[PDB]
Amino acid sequence: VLYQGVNCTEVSVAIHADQLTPTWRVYSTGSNVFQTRAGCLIGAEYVNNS
Amino acid sequence: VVVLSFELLHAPATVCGPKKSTNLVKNKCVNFNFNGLTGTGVLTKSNKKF
């Protein structure tokens, strides 16, 4: 899931506080949260290989 | 007959209903009501000079 236009830190804080309107949660672990210019991508592992 | 005339547009209102005030919460997403003006948002100290 890509949360468009938002910083991953804010999304993680909102998740921990149970402040988000969608009540589903993507399981979050290390290496599954990646910040891109399109938004915060949770549920995909970023790799160096192109 | 009594006609009660009033303007609801000007910001510096002086006649409010008997609604109780709460404390002031800053830096959190809060549903606020300031003299009848309502909304949802994060309140912070302003650097604006009113």
Binding site: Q4, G5, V6, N7, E10, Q35, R37, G39 | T44, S46, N47
Partner: protein, 47 residues
Amino acid sequence: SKPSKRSPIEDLLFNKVTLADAGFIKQYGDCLGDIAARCAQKFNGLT
């Protein structure tokens, strides 16, 4: 010799055109300042 590895002409072309959006995760411009437009400030639903 410079980041982005663009040609001298490309560097000139990019500096001469002024972008309005320059989209990024622009959540740092939402406090204080002058809350400059951009044109919905990510507040009125336009991104």
